[PDB]
């Protein structure tokens, strides 16, 4: 899961 990147 990348979230905020």
């Amino acid at each position, epitope marked *: *899961g*990348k*979230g*905020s*990147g």
Partner: antibody
Amino acid sequence: EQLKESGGRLVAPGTPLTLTCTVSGFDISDYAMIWVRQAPGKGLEWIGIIYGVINDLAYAKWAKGRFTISRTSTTVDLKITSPTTEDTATYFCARGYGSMDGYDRLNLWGQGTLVTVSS
Amino acid sequence: LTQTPSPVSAAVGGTVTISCRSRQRVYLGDWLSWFQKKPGQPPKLLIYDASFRGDGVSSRFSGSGSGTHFTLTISGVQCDDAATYYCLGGYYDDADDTFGGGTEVVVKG
């Protein structure tokens, strides 16, 4: 569902200031909270985000250390570490949809609070 | 981000289209939101994900585009549409998210 900003006031340059966004009608831990500002006569400016649904945080590439963002259970805060006249603006917080994939859909906004930086 | 220069003019009942261009591709090709902004009022979300209309937003507002080129179209223009319009580019990194310069719409009544 409502957002209310508070903390705006007149501050001398260099004097730290913390703005607060208080939440009601929903839970922060199911969303993400975003800070945006607008200096007088200028455009909207994205500042940073703090997630509740996942545990993540980001500042705009240009922040470089000008802001701190943190949460409580019912608020999110924005600290302007060393305010300049460039930081004189109306500050808004907004709720976005969130997941592992990031955020989206800023469909809820507070009314804003005014920071005035002068000697 | 580069938007249609201000001001832009439209007659009541008329149709206006404003555009937004990003140097970089937005997230999943379509992370772009449109906001209405009036003085003394908070931003109001019109379109998210390039073409999806916000809850309770008039069907007079619509958006389209992909990658780096996007538009907002206002049809059946009302005086109530007199405002500045901002696009927001969302990217893989949140730190890159940016507003466009804003496009002021002047409504000719």
